[PDB]
């Protein structure tokens, strides 16, 4: 019965991730479809639950047509990849100021996606051409605590690591605030 | 496995299955063990009442697998079985197993016990009426695993298997679990998840690393069986084939160039069985090109919305989402990308008709219900959410317009 | 073919059984009704499948499943009213096959409960004299020159409760006497033989004789239960003992169909009678003796004073010391069946069951009979070799 938003810059793997979870098939192998806005039910702590997921665009031209669905939501979350910190810079400033403007007191855990690549040498090689890549969990925990959030979670697209826990603490934010 | 030895296997397998939440299978263990002694006592001619081991083929076909000690032992084993079903949330088969019990009590004439034997069958069907089709019962999430590697794995050096994991164990759990269980028995690093889904066999794996294909699967049935397997229990009881849709899109992966492959695999012995795992054997593939899947997958999101309305509950949260997937597409293709590619006047000249004709009736039924859906979302919106739904029908009304231009036809 | 309207004969015929207050015949109607419906939907693909219920179901157009179940539903409620509880189960047994296929559940439950209510209702009334199915009587009217069914028809009638002999006859006469000739019918009190022309024509005459659904030895094992003595009985034997011709004889006629039935009476097909050797008359009474006491010991909630009297008779001017005349020689021995006399002895296992039951008010009436017992025991067990 739970509502839950997925903010974030475009191509922070928002859709790429949720597609891979609700349908168990490993990322990049997700059987693709249109529609968008996904959901499925998960076993947490002890009880089972139905968890709902609203997809949001980071594509700029869909502002003003985004906030109208934030009504009714019971847990929020903001998605940034630890890949491009241009998303990390743009999430303190675009999405916390957006949460204060609609449902400003419902928990919104900010989460880091695409952890897998933080040890990939061929991407640190493209990262060193512009000399930026790491987004460290010390800074991650601190950006989210200073963003008054509840938890930051280093999650990964593939390798499955970091995952599961996120949707779990999404509802674990609701049960035990 | 001899009479004396094949019996001892089932027992300690029951208490072991009992010990660690493998209920249904421990339950199945006892009624499968109790058939084994039914023939051995038939094989000495000590005497469906007393008819060898096929009388337990009623509850499961794999009861045959046990044929290759006295009467009160035969009834103490079903008695122990029936309770194991009572905890395994499988209230139904308890009727098909109290038959040979009654068939002997009616032979020794006891009545009181036959009375409270017929009572606990009523005490089950009653608990069913508030369980069945409430989605309270759940076992589910059978997985398709395969080991690959010679000079690595001993007995299971390659066979393709089908695990029955329990409750809501997703793949994040079982994958990390097999990886971890086998990564530390042959050194780290060299334990590749091999997430593939494709019927791998080329073994272009540089044999210094060991692979473990995993791919979620679903109890698969046809059109005539789907009338028979109506509720949530009936689909898990005795399943031959599970199917998984595997994408084989041209080149990498992700409207017109995207294709998927249904590969069904059977399971030899029928679920539920004694041992948790059981092997696959064949993966027959029905390939669906980007129009056949368009017909079938755009049909998929049609019946689903229609299935949230016949429901009595209808939870304000679960509706508004799926219609946003239906009317207000964002960060995805959109339901209209199907129209422009396989329905526009310029398109749909080499695709056969009747195909495209069925795509019409699915398209309309997907509309006339889509509109029925927005009205219900108006029944439990309440307060602020009303300003929102005012946009939902807007996106929907516009969706009708564009559908009319691609199709050269009026859309109401 | 046809009587597919005489399916309404039975419904009519049933309603008179219900009005007659003869309900055990009645429930049987509604079954053969649903037995006949079950062949018509079988021939058109939409039959003797009740053979467990009653084997004489061989003698069996807009129809539905719902109309078939409504034929069953209104039969169980006759069974439960007839007090023949044991069969509710074998009846309600395939009504569930179509409710499980249709998966009504909420009906599968409270049905499976009605069948639980049955076996819990028979365990309370079994081994109580509370079950009065009815009484059996062989009849025979010989109106060769009058209004006889065919010729001298002979066929057994089932009267309910405990009335009979006098009650059935004096009811049978005043009922045949108004359609026949008043004061032209005959009593015919003697059971043996009965052969026409050996009595001058008065142009009527009817016969009446009590009978007991006699079972063999092989049957008395499965027929240990109370309702089993009154179900699937193809034969009733009546004992006609000349005792002297001045040995005992017994006629064991078999009827054509199996009780129960849609009609209160059915035709016989064979009268079979045998005189029993004198030494054969002993093993019949002294063995009927042996089981009568075993039945009083076991029962539980024993009728008490009934238990007391039965011993009091077992010794001696006419006591069961008939074996004093069956030991000192006499006929075809065949082990004399004195081991059947030897088992009747161990019915001394009665005196102990009495010794637990009384109060210390008769704390002496017991040693008193335990002395008439021992005195009648080994001391009169001298004519049978050793003692027990």
Curated annotation (Swiss-Prot), chain A:
Give the record's keywords alphabetically: Cell membrane, Cell projection, Cytoplasm, Cytoskeleton, Disease variant, Glycoprotein, GTP-binding, Hydrolase, Intellectual disability, Isopeptide bond, Lipoprotein, Membrane, Methylation, Nucleotide-binding, Prenylation, Ubl conjugation
Assign the protein's first listed, main location to one coarse class.
cytoplasm
Residue ranges annotated as motif Effector region: 30-38
Cross-linked residues, Glycyl lysine isopeptide (Lys-Gly) (interchain with G-Cter in ubiquitin): 164
Q: Any idea what job this protein has?
A: Plasma membrane-associated small GTPase which cycles between an active GTP-bound and inactive GDP-bound state. In active state binds to a variety of effector proteins to regulate cellular responses, such as cell spreading and the formation of actin-based protusions including lamellipodia and membrane ruffles. Promotes cell adhesion and spreading on fibrinogen in a CIB1 and alpha-IIb/beta3 integrin-mediated manner.
What gene name is given for the protein in this entry?
A: RAC3
Question: EC?
Answer: 3.6.5.2
* GO cellular component term, pick one: neuron projection
- Quaternary structure and interacting proteins, as annotated: Interacts with the GEF protein DOCK7, which promotes the exchange between GDP and GTP, and therefore activates it. Interacts with C1D. Interacts (via C-terminal region) with CIB1; the interaction induces their association with the cytoskeleton upon alpha-IIb/beta3 integrin-mediated adhesion. Interacts with NRBP.
Glycosylated residues, per the record, are 30
* Natural source organism: Homo sapiens
- Spell out the protein name for this chain: Ras-related C3 botulinum toxin substrate 3
Associated clinical condition: Neurodevelopmental disorder with structural brain anomalies and dysmorphic facies: An autosomal dominant neurodevelopmental disorder characterized by global developmental delay, severe intellectual disability, poor language, seizures, dysmorphic features, and thin corpus callosum.
Where found, per UniProt?
Answer: Cytoplasm; Endomembrane system; Cell projection, Lamellipodium; Cytoplasm, Perinuclear region
GO MF, one example: calcium-dependent protein binding
Q: Which PROSITE patterns match?
A: RHO
Swiss-Prot record, chain B:
The segment(s) forming the DOCKER domain are 1-412
Expression induction or repression: Isoforms 1 and 2 are up-regulated in response to IL4 in B-cells but not T-cells.
**UniProt subcellular location:** Nucleus; Cytoplasm; Cell projection, Dendritic spine
Expression (tissue specificity) = Expressed at low level in brain and lung. Isoform 1 is enriched in normal T-cells, isoform 3 is enriched in normal B-cells and chronic lymphocytic leukemia (CLL) B-cells.
Q: What else is known?
A: 'Zizim' means 'spike' in Hebrew.
Family named by the database record: Belongs to the DOCK family.
Query: What is the protein's known function?
Result: Guanine nucleotide-exchange factor (GEF) that activates CDC42 and RAC1 by exchanging bound GDP for free GTP. Essential for dendritic spine morphogenesis in Purkinje cells and in hippocampal neurons, via a CDC42-mediated pathway. Sustains B-cell lymphopoiesis in secondary lymphoid tissues and regulates FCER2/CD23 expression.
Present the record's domain note.
The DOCKER domain may mediate some GEF activity.
Recorded protein name is Dedicator of cytokinesis protein 10
Q: Which organism is it from?
A: Homo sapiens
């Amino acid at each position: 019965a739970i509502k839950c938003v997925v903010v974030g810059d475009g191509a922070v793997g928002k859709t790429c991730l949720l597609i891979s979870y609700t349908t168990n098939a490993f990322p990049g192998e997700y059987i693709p479809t249109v529609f968008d806005n996904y959901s499925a039910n998960v076993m947490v702590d002890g009880k089972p639950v139905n968890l709902g997921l609203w997809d949001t665009a980071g594509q700029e031209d869909y502002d003003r047509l985004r906030p109208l669905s934030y009504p009714q939501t019971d847990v929020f979350l903001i998605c940034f990849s630890l890949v491009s910190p241009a998303s990390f810079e743009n999430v303190r400033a675009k999405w916390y100021p957006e949460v204060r403007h609609h449902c400003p007191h419902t928990p919104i855990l900010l989460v880091g996606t695409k952890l897998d690549l933080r040890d990939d040498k061929d991407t640190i090689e493209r990262l060193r051409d512009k000399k930026l890549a790491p987004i460290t969990y010390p800074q991650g925990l601190a950006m989210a605590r200073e963003i008054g959030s509840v938890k930051y979670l280093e999650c990964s697209a593939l390798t499955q690591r970091g995952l599961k826990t996120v949707f779990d603490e999404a509802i674990r934010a609701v049960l035990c605030p | 496995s001899t009479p004396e030895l094949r019996r001892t296997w089932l027992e300690s397998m029951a208490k072991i299955h009992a010990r660690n939440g493998d209920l249904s299978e421990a339950a199945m263990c006892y009624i499968h063990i109790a058939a084994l002694i039914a023939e051995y006592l038939k094989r000495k001619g000590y005497w469906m009442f007393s008819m060898g081991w096929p009388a337990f083929l009623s509850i499961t076909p794999n009861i045959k697998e046990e044929g290759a000690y006295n009467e009160n032992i035969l009834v103490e084993q079903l008695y122990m079985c029936v309770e194991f079903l009572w905890k395994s949330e499988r209230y139904e088969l308890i009727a098909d197993v109290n038959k040979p019990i009654i068939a002997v009590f009616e032979k020794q004439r006891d009545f009181k016990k036959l009375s409270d034997l017929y009572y606990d069958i009523h005490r089950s069907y009653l608990k069913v009426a508030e369980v069945v089709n409430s989605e309270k019962r759940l076992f589910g999430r059978y997985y398709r695993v395969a080991f690959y590697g010679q000079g690595f794995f001993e007995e299971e050096e390659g066979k393709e298997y089908i695990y029955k994991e329990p409750k809501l164990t997703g793949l994040s759990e079982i994958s990390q679990r097999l990886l971890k269980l086998y990564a530390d028995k042959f050194g780290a690093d060299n334990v590749k998840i091999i997430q593939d889904s494709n019927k791998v066999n080329p073994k272009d794996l540089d044999p210094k690393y060991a692979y473990i294909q995993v791919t979620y699967v679903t109890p698969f049935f046809e059109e005539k069986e789907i009338e028979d397997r109506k509720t949530d229990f009936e689909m898990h009881h005795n399943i031959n084939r599970f199917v998984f849709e595997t994408p084989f899109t041209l080149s990498g992966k992700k409207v017109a160039e995207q294709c998927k492959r249904r590969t069904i695999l059977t399971t030899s012995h029928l679920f539920p069985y004694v041992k948790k795992r059981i092997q696959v054997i064949s993966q027959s593939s029905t390939e669906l090109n980007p129009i056949e899947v368009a017909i079938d997958e755009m049909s998929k999101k049609v019946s689903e919305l229609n299935q949230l309305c016949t429901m009595e509950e209808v939870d304000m949260i679960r509706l508004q989402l799926k219609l946003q997937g239906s009317v207000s597409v964002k960060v995805n293709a959109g339901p209209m990308a199907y129209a422009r590619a396989f329905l526009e006047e310029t398109n749909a000249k080499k695709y056969p008709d009747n195909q495209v004709k069925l795509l019409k009736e699915i398209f309309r039924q997907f509309a006339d219900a889509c509109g029925q859906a927005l009205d219900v979302n108006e029944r439990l919106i309440k307060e602020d959410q009303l300003e929102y739904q005012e946009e939902l029908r807007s996106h929907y009304k516009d969706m009708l317009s564009e559908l009319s231009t691609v199709m050269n036809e009026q859309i109401t």
